[PDB]
Write a protein that holds these residues in place. Sequence first.
Motif, mmCIF file in Angstrom:
data_model
loop_
_atom_site.group_PDB
_atom_site.id
_atom_site.type_symbol
_atom_site.label_atom_id
_atom_site.label_comp_id
_atom_site.label_asym_id
_atom_site.label_seq_id
_atom_site.Cartn_x
_atom_site.Cartn_y
_atom_site.Cartn_z
ATOM 1 N N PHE A 83 0.855 -1.252 0.000
ATOM 2 C CA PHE A 83 0.000 0.000 0.000
ATOM 3 C C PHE A 83 0.851 1.245 0.000
ATOM 4 C CE2 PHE A 83 -4.419 -1.289 0.765
ATOM 5 C CZ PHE A 83 -4.297 -2.637 0.939
ATOM 6 N N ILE A 84 0.558 2.190 -0.892
ATOM 7 C CA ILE A 84 1.296 3.417 -0.954
ATOM 8 C C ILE A 84 0.404 4.654 -1.217
ATOM 9 C CG2 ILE A 84 1.896 3.067 -3.336
ATOM 10 C CD1 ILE A 84 4.333 4.527 -0.981
ATOM 11 N N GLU A 85 0.666 5.753 -0.522
ATOM 12 C CA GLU A 85 0.116 7.042 -0.898
ATOM 13 C C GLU A 85 1.049 7.727 -1.861
ATOM 14 O OE1 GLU A 85 -0.579 7.612 3.670
ATOM 15 O OE2 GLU A 85 -1.426 9.402 2.729
ATOM 16 N N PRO A 86 0.616 8.276 -3.003
ATOM 17 C CA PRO A 86 1.573 8.886 -3.991
ATOM 18 C C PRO A 86 2.049 10.306 -3.502
ATOM 19 C CG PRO A 86 -0.619 9.051 -4.872
ATOM 20 C CD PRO A 86 -0.737 8.206 -3.566
ATOM 21 N N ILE A 87 1.337 10.897 -2.489
ATOM 22 C CA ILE A 87 1.739 12.063 -1.723
ATOM 23 C C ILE A 87 1.280 11.642 -0.318
ATOM 24 C CG2 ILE A 87 1.509 14.533 -1.209
ATOM 25 C CD1 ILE A 87 0.708 15.014 -4.081
ATOM 26 N N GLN A 88 2.142 11.552 0.692
ATOM 27 C CA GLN A 88 1.653 11.228 2.080
ATOM 28 C C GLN A 88 0.990 12.426 2.697
ATOM 29 O OE1 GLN A 88 4.098 9.567 5.263
ATOM 30 N NE2 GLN A 88 3.651 7.524 4.609
ATOM 31 N N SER A 89 -0.306 12.390 3.030
ATOM 32 C CA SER A 89 -0.977 13.580 3.555
ATOM 33 C C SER A 89 -0.927 13.725 5.084
ATOM 34 C CB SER A 89 -2.445 13.629 3.059
ATOM 35 O OG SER A 89 -3.206 14.614 3.837
ATOM 36 N N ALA A 90 -1.584 12.897 5.844
ATOM 37 C CA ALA A 90 -1.489 12.951 7.328
ATOM 38 C C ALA A 90 -0.042 12.848 7.804
ATOM 39 C CB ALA A 90 -2.351 11.885 7.989
ATOM 40 N N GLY A 91 0.800 12.091 7.074
ATOM 41 C CA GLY A 91 2.263 11.985 7.362
ATOM 42 C C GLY A 91 3.068 13.214 7.163
ATOM 43 N N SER A 111 1.060 -7.263 -5.366
ATOM 44 C CA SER A 111 0.073 -6.285 -5.946
ATOM 45 C C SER A 111 0.364 -4.869 -5.378
ATOM 46 C CB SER A 111 -1.343 -6.711 -5.498
ATOM 47 O OG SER A 111 -2.310 -5.886 -6.168
ATOM 48 N N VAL A 112 0.444 -3.891 -6.265
ATOM 49 C CA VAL A 112 0.724 -2.470 -5.910
ATOM 50 C C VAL A 112 -0.666 -1.738 -5.814
ATOM 51 C CG1 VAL A 112 1.823 -0.272 -6.505
ATOM 52 C CG2 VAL A 112 2.995 -2.458 -7.005
ATOM 53 N N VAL A 113 -0.979 -1.273 -4.585
ATOM 54 C CA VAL A 113 -2.245 -0.569 -4.265
ATOM 55 C C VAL A 113 -1.939 0.902 -4.044
ATOM 56 C CG1 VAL A 113 -4.275 -0.487 -2.785
ATOM 57 C CG2 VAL A 113 -3.070 -2.711 -3.080
ATOM 58 N N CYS A 114 -2.469 1.760 -4.909
ATOM 59 C CA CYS A 114 -2.244 3.233 -4.844
ATOM 60 C C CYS A 114 -3.458 3.880 -4.147
ATOM 61 C CB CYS A 114 -2.013 3.929 -6.229
ATOM 62 S SG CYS A 114 -1.278 5.527 -6.145
ATOM 63 N N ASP A 115 -3.262 4.387 -2.911
ATOM 64 C CA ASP A 115 -4.347 5.010 -2.062
ATOM 65 C C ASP A 115 -4.406 6.471 -2.400
ATOM 66 O OD1 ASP A 115 -5.898 6.185 -0.160
ATOM 67 O OD2 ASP A 115 -5.073 5.109 1.603
ATOM 68 N N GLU A 116 -5.408 6.832 -3.273
ATOM 69 C CA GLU A 116 -5.649 8.178 -3.687
ATOM 70 C C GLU A 116 -6.884 8.787 -3.023
ATOM 71 O OE1 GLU A 116 -4.759 9.428 -7.679
ATOM 72 O OE2 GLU A 116 -2.939 8.130 -7.739
ATOM 73 N N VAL A 117 -7.229 8.282 -1.834
ATOM 74 C CA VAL A 117 -8.396 8.813 -1.071
ATOM 75 C C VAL A 117 -8.276 10.314 -0.853
ATOM 76 C CG1 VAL A 117 -9.648 8.747 1.143
ATOM 77 C CG2 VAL A 117 -9.128 6.615 -0.115
ATOM 78 N N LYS A 118 -7.086 10.818 -0.524
ATOM 79 C CA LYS A 118 -6.911 12.242 -0.201
ATOM 80 C C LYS A 118 -6.521 13.091 -1.433
ATOM 81 C CE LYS A 118 -6.631 15.517 3.257
ATOM 82 N NZ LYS A 118 -5.784 15.262 4.435
ATOM 83 N N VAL A 119 -5.569 12.571 -2.301
ATOM 84 C CA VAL A 119 -4.966 13.365 -3.389
ATOM 85 C C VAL A 119 -5.462 12.961 -4.787
ATOM 86 C CG1 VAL A 119 -3.022 14.046 -1.889
ATOM 87 C CG2 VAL A 119 -2.787 12.140 -3.524
ATOM 88 N N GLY A 120 -6.503 12.124 -4.901
ATOM 89 C CA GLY A 120 -7.081 11.665 -6.145
ATOM 90 C C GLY A 120 -8.009 12.716 -6.824
ATOM 91 N N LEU A 121 -8.486 12.277 -7.968
ATOM 92 C CA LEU A 121 -9.621 12.919 -8.676
ATOM 93 C C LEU A 121 -9.467 14.414 -8.892
ATOM 94 C CD1 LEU A 121 -12.528 10.693 -7.298
ATOM 95 C CD2 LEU A 121 -11.231 10.383 -9.431
ATOM 96 N N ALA A 122 -8.488 14.756 -9.747
ATOM 97 C CA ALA A 122 -8.165 16.117 -10.213
ATOM 98 C C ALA A 122 -7.363 16.984 -9.302
ATOM 99 C CB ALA A 122 -9.408 16.921 -10.738
#
Lengths: 439, 439
Positions: free
Chosen positions: A206-214, A237-248
């Motif tokens: 699991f990876i954030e592509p920009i760490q936000s809370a961190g 399997s590479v899981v990209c967590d875009e919950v915070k920095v996703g969607l534009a």
Amino acid sequence: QGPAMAGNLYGRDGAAIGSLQKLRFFPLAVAGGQGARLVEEDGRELIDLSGAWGAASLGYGHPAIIEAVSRAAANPAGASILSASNAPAVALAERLTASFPRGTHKVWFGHSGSDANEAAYRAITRATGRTGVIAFIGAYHGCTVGSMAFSGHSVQADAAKADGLILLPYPDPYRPYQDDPTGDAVLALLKERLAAVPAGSIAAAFIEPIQSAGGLIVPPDGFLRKFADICRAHGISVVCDEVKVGLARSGRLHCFEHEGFVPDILVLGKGLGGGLPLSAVIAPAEILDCASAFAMQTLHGNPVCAAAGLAVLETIEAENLTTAAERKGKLLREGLARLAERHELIGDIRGRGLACGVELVRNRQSREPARAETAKLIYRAYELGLVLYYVGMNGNVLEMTPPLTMTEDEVRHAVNLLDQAFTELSTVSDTLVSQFAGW
Amino acid sequence: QGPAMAGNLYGRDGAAIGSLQKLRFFPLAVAGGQGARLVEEDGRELIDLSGAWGAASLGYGHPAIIEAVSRAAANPAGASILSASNAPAVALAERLTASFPRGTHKVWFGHSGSDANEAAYRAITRATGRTGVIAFIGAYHGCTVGSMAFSGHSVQADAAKADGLILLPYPDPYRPYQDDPTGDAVLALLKERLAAVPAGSIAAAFIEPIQSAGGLIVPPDGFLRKFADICRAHGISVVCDEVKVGLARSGRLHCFEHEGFVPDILVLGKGLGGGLPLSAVIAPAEILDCASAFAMQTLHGNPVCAAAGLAVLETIEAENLTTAAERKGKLLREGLARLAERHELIGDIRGRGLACGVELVRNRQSREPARAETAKLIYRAYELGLVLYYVGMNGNVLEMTPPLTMTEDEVRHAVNLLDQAFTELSTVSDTLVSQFAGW
Ligand SMILES: */C(=N\[C@@H]1CCCCNC1=O)c1c(COP(=O)(O)O)cnc(C)c1O
Ligand SMILES: */C(=N\[C@@H]1CCCCNC1=O)c1c(COP(=O)(O)O)cnc(C)c1O
């Protein structure tokens, strides 16, 4: 506190709602919202630079959210995707798959980033037989038992962790692990940790592509592509967590577009729902089709929240919000660089698009964090009519994730209010700011 | 399946959405809804005796849900309760506490019954230091790692279970443990299990006051009051999970009102949101105030879903739905008793209010379950224009949890459609019904 302050909306909140879910920095007490502005019980307006932690992607009262939610509430296609197919959920799933590099992937719907990350982990472990997992110190993947098991931030420090969790340092250009600005030392670490455990035993990374809370940390150039290469050499399997920095928000539709790799699995949430609870997993079919009746909650895929999500995707196209986020993020970071020419407390300005961080330090040479000053700064900002919060493991990074629809004029006004808050942070007493626990 | 059936809404659902969250019994494919009726892609209407598993408390397109959701979407009080107080969430918390026996209790908000039960368990263990827990075989408390840890149903059979979980048989009048119709044998069992573990080690006991997924089982008279006495003698918190049978459906506002005890903690969900994702925990202040920033998700307490919940509570009062549920449930069970005079497959009719179950058996003397016939019966019903599902550990209990606003005329028509489905269940071939996995 006398009876008038006890009887106001903030006082009532203290008497009626438990502290268990609260993350409070100042006595913000909201009764309405319009555009990028919040309105308090007393009628005072504030500009919202937090965008409700990135949830308010289109701001407050956007016509496309009103249209969608009102229409679906008046003629709802049932209440669920579990025991019925429904038209809004299936349309949303086809729009999400069309946005992701055809034929190979399907969707799972949830309520939150927590439930989405949890379902991605359970599904891979069910489909592959593998139980181990890689994640980062500072990583925030959720606040449920199943999602805290592979998180790395202080919120999850006392949680039970997965068997076979490998936790790595996230490479930070401002504070580099092993004094290596490239992140190559973290890659070499990963290779050693994989050698100490049985081969083919790791399910996922699991990876954030920009760490936000961190800390609003953008990793060094090329690190994430190299990391994804290692994982693929081991069948992970590479899981990209875009919950915070996703969607534009990053200035590209999907943040991984900046990083020269395509993940196996994409996790979405927060601003996907425009102010309603909506999350998604986009994953290979074999992963999501390995079981039925396995990861399910009754209101998953309800048509009101699916209609809101279709409105967010449609509005990103119709109002050209990817390009807008790039343009406005440049304007915001240019403004902040002008403030750094007079306010020595600013040590670093970083981010992509409308995901921006400003790191506060006691001295520019030492880089010693300035926690107490950060907490007073955002308190003073709130008094002046500007809402923003802080992030990071040392509590000293201002976060800015405004609505994608914030105007340029609103960005300039927010920078001007911040200038005053820097100048006057010491006017907030120690005793006042200590009434708010933060994080 | 040819291209026309692949290109219809059910076919599209198979290609776009993973099986992971699906619980399908027949190819129900919904595009709208009005009152107690669903409308399929092709325009066919069906009467919904499931009420979306009890989520659609006011049916589809109720004017009070349209008003509330449209109003809040056009002027939303931010998007969250975490980092702001907001007026709709605080008003909802005060209405929920006023409904529960003053001063002692506060509220936690979530998205689902799963997240609410999980947060209740974590909070007690944090506040008391205790880690053990009591629950029932057949009990369904959720489908997340944290809520499956103290569940007992087949959906959760392979999940990791809590340390110190004590799982007990749920006393069923139709199939009594130790051949004791009273349930006293289960009480004696509990006392022995408590003696084999260290004293004061149990945090909590979770109970459904009617087990729904376990079989629509109403426990024997006085069992639950006696059970709650034992727990209180050992300092154990009694948690009443009313996610499925709460909020007027039983013919009393709270189901525990039938049972002669008051729980320490009340858990709510499903029909609380009227078709939107909303759950709540009502608990002593010391439990919910033991920590901050501890059990939190970004969209918790969002004002759109809180406004829907205030509309459900207000409508239960304005349309007299507690009394309605009592009256209509009697009419439904009277109708079903008339069907049992001709259809020998019916072995038992049970429940409270508009939570009803009909148990199907191969022979009335042996009570042998009739799983295959139950699955065909609900398939035939779907073909005829009636939606209902089955529950139970043996797959043989028809469940009826219609909208609280279903009319008497609609109840009579639904009984008439069921009569035909009983007569014609054998017309559904083995091969057709086997395409749907169920549970
Ligand atoms: C959301 N992260 C936190 C959430 C709590 C409030 C503090 N601010 C943050 O940004 C999140 C999640 C969890 O989503 P959920 O809160 O809806 O369950 C998962 N992954 C990421 C990267 C983030 O930021
Ligand atoms: C809901 N129970 C199940 C849910 C899945 C679909 C099958 N039918 C049922 O009735 C439930 C929950 C969990 O709530 P959630 O699905 O919103 O997370 C918790 N407690 C009870 C008693 C019930 O029924």
